[PDB]
Amino acid sequence: ALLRILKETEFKKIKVLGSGAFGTVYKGLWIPEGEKVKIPVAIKELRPKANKEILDEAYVMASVDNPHVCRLLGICLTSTVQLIMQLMPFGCLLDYVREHKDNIGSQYLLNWCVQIAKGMNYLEDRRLVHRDLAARNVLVKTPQHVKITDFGRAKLLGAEEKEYHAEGGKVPIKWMALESILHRIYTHQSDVWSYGVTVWELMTFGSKPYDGIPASEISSILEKGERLPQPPICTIDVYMIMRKCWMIDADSRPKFRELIIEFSKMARDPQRYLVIQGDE
């Protein structure tokens, strides 16, 4: 996997897919000069650093090559930065589970848990802390295959850095580990906490965590030992994996490699672990 530098004439925006503080993402078409191959892509136009700085960050990003991380294919530098990425035709997993809640079986849910853990383990191998894992930031390539994506919060740790120490950026409190809320500290193990919340989202078919509760109250609820409730479809075995992800001691939490093993075992006999009517 290598970074391609695109000229504006190489790609076209077709329609908007979504928008946020990061910028806007479009469905588009990329035709590399004289290659005659038409590639469906997502184009993320970000809302300055030197061009070489941006290209360097894009090079590292483009080297992230794993079946369960959405890949940067190329970049175009003009008045704006435009990132050309793999298109995930089914959109964010949050909306997908909300839409198809009555037609999603245990096999798909547990498989997604495995896949997200595989992608996160790869990011950890690359020394990348994601810092924004949530169902909204997982994308659906096919119903059978999902990929993690990133909107600017991910950080590369230095050879001797064990944690990332954040500053004033806005934070997704309800997905964060307690140590991140209290001390602005982020690690692969705080990503594990977020992974647990992400799994809870999937198992509740996209429900809102700590629904209706002010973000300002969350740290106090967590300090009292309270956590997100057991989803209706979850046997206690699955809920206990979530609860392990939210233990106060970061080193008490499972690592992604362990999560891959545990969810993979469950995915072999999915109906023993999730209880879904009509499944199957």
Ligand SMILES: *CCC(=O)N[C@@H]1CN(c2nc(Nc3cn(C)nc3OC)c3ncn(C)c3n2)C[C@H]1F
């Ligand atoms: C739930 C989060 C959300 O809606 N985020 C938006 C969508 N984003 C995004 N979307 C796609 N693909 C997509 C979405 N829809 C409705 N249709 C499609 O494709 C036909 C995508 N592919 C790759 N990347 C990076 C994507 N991002 C991100 C936010 F804009």
